[PDB]
A and B are shown apart, each in its own frame.
With several copies, the nearest count.
Chain A
Amino acid sequence: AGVGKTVLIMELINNVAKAHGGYSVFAGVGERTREGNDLYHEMIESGVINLKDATSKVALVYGQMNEPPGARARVALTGLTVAEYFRDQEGQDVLLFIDNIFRFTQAGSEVSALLGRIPSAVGYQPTLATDMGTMQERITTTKKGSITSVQAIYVPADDLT
């Protein structure tokens, strides 16, 4: 918060579009609608975003936190397919600003809850780690493209354990 995080993210978007020619992918699952409109305005202000100008240097999405994660969680493979569209299906290297992983963790946790699943020791899905790696694994610098992951490491109580 206030750490230039949005600022650095926009810096990365600009450096990709100019220093690499690569656009950006926004998928803010569980984003605040207030934060959503704010990001819309701010990214539009940055110029890499414009819903009409067709010169925006990015692709956008955000998610409803108020919504069940059973909705909010699936946006992951959606952004994955999007990255394929822009990179494997559109010959490019790309990154993905994604906040937050621990948010994605809670999403998978609620998913396992839906499974009535014996939760992980961290309450997650019994093999939540499987998707988590797959979350990491779904994007890679493959021959299809250089799938980069802008990863927001949401510090759960800053407990790395």
Chain B
Amino acid sequence: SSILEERILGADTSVDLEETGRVLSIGDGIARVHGLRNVQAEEMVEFSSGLKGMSLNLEPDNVGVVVFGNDKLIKEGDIVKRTGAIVDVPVGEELLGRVVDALGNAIDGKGPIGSKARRRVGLKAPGIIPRISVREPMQTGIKAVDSLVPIGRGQRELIIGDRQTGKTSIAIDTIINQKRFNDGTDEKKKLYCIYVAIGQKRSTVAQLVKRLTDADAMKYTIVVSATASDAAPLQYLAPYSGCSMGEYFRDNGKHALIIYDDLSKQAVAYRQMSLLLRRPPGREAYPGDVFYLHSRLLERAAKMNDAFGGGSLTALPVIETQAGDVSAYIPTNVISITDGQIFLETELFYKGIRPAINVGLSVSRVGSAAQTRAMKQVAGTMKLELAQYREVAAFALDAATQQLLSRGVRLTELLKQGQYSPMAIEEQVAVIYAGVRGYLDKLEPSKITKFENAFLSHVISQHQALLGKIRTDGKISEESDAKLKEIVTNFLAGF
């Protein structure tokens, strides 16, 4: 009633001096139009269709149009307002606690996060000044994974998987890990990290947002949407969207990361884009710039040093291990552009062993650099012995080999985990010493998981204070170690 009037009230409509570009050539979503040459490149100009477009290609006699919309709702000849304004996102973390599109359209409702500053989304790569060694351990909440490859703040990483390969499960677990991290009062612990989905189902992403609502991780989270409905530029911009989204807070000193999944999607988008451009791309329909295209967002993985205020911009790629075909020129660049990659095994998951990281194939050069050293001591030999047991698993009756076999049995029975189990490196270092102790190697690796749940509960209850002590033990306290062996025997009785 009167409230609808009040909304209508104060409606602002101030006019301004502007010309436009009447469309000339229309078809396939790109208009080779004429006029409005007073627009600039990389700009975000808008048409009579209200759609705002980025600079496609100025012709000597025409003007090509790049937009990510639907021109079946646009007839030819339409006047395109030469906004000449570099395609710019909003600036600031207003999306924090908000789930918006790649262009800020919260199709999840929840109103607009009207970010009062606009990010000049024509951002560029970080340079050499802040480019220095990173030090912040990544609050991963993934027991073996973080154990296997601890990561730093600012990293240029990657991840590859097959259909429904837990890669989304991986991201969800990461988000879960961010809550207590974002509950960490320190901005290094506080996880103002980012996450975007690519080409995903709008409804699947809705289920994801439902989990996040259950997760309450929106405190840790801001959502930029690239669903399956995304246009080709839209997916293409999505990497740029996330890059500038990071840039706002990395320049706001934030130690955080961004989760876009999956980069392999916009590859289809860019391919179709070039195809619509009729320019001859290569294999995978791939034009050559695809790397440099990808590299544009890729170089944004900034460990922004004090030379950039101490913010962090960590980036981990998501391009699917399509049938685990490493030989993809797409994958070829994918490993080739990141300082690391998360290879995920399928057979374990095919054998149902979830998690199923490609322990043979996965590799990340971050490790103890930016990592809890306590678990590092507790489990460096553990990882080595896992490798040996694989070397032992490379056979099918040395009781030395048999011992290595039981060791690997426990190692496998332990390392994996279920979905949505956020935690710190605490129980990580705990079980790391415990298996490193191997005093349960006698225990059935089948019974290992059960007794593991048991020991975890025991620690969470009693040594919870001792757990805080070990947290204070920013070193292997022989006292904490003794408490460890003691409670180890204690829970062993409870087994």
Contacts and interface: CB of A to CB of B under 8 A. Distances in A.
Chain A in direct contact with chain B (Cβ < 8 angstroms): yes
Nearest to B227: A137
A157 B280 contact: no
A154 B335 CA distance: 12
Contact of B131 (A36, A72, A117): A36
B216 to A, nearest CB: 24
Given A41-B133, A160-B323, A32 B156 contact: yes
Contact of A130 (B126, B156, B272): B272
A33 B322 CA distance: 29
Contacts, number: 128
Nearest to B28: A115
B278 A106 contact: no
Interface stretch (B142-150, B167-175, B195-203): B195-203
B292 A126 contact: no
Nearest to A109: B288
Contacts of B329: 156-157
B465 interface: no
Interface in A83-138: 103, 106-107, 109-110, 113-115, 117-123, 126-127, 129-130, 133-134, 136-137
B279 A64 contact: no
A37 B303 CA distance: 11
Contact of B287 (A113, A136, A158, A160): A113
A52 interface: no
Contacts of A107: 288
Nearest to B322: A161
B335 A137 contact: no
B492 interface: no
Contacts of B298: 65
B295 interface: yes
A127 B231 CA distance: 10
Interface of B: 28, 124-128, 131-133, 156, 199, 201-203, 227-229, 232, 268-269, 271-272, 275-276, 278-285, 287-289, 291-292, 295, 298-299, 301, 303, 322-323, 327-329, 332-333, 335-337, 339, 341
Given A37-B128, A120-B285, 6 more contacts: A107-B288, A113-B287, A123-B282, A126-B276, A130-B272, A137-B227
Interface of A: 1-2, 30, 32-34, 36-38, 40-41, 62, 64-69, 72, 103, 106-107, 109-110, 113-115, 117-123, 126-127, 129-130, 133-134, 136-137, 140-142, 154, 156-158, 160-161
